Amino acid sequence: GSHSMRYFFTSVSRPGRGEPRFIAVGYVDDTQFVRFDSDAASQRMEPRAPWIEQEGPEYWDGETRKVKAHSQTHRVDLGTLRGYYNQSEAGSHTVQRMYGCDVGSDWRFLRGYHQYAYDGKDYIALKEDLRSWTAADMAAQTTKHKWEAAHVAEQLRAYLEGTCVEWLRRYLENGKETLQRTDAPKTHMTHHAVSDHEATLRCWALSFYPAEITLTWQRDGEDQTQDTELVETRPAGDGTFQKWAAVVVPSGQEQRYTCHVQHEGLPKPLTLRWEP
């Protein structure tokens, strides 16, 4: 199946309270493997998975110098964007950056992406073709011209088609036991009498990986959106994910309702039915 390596960067200004917060996080698929935090003891890039710990001091020195370079760019960006939008120095602002590459089952290049946000909103994003930019507003147009002058699109295309996929493959090999596993959802259903007229059926998917999952309810084989609740997929904290879907049903009608579970790790889609 498909794979991804993604890096996530957040910078927050602290008016009248000194240097801005900077946090960097690296993921292969749904697994965190690296972190940097400006508020932490080490002032170094730190490992967060077993299979990255085995990299030499050259890797950690390299990643530390680079994440600090990212930190310095975001520190400048906060000052620049305060100016571009003429905002007061009284208010906290946020810069976010996300980039990475997808590979197909053959571990070859599929797409790259580089996205940048100011205060929770698209600022500038690289297009599918990796040669041209979408700017959100007139201030991002200033950035877009600066980035076209410096040929930033060409530079990122080269990282995303080259270094990005080549280190993704390495990480997949070194982390074979973790990253190349699929854990099927363990499933069960629960039942809560709610009145003399209704009951909740809750369909559970536990201990699954990766995160991507579909839980659907049917009533007599017909897709049922009405009277359903679907919670966001949530970390269990052990590298696995959890989700549930519930439906409120008339008293006595429980057996009319089926829960359908689709996951990469299920050879076949599961059908569950309430069994008392």
Partner: peptide, 10 residues
């Protein structure tokens, strides 16, 4: 592995 490419300021 972070890029050392294509990381320009705003």
């Amino acid at each position: 592995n972070l890029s050392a490419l294509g990381i320009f300021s705003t």
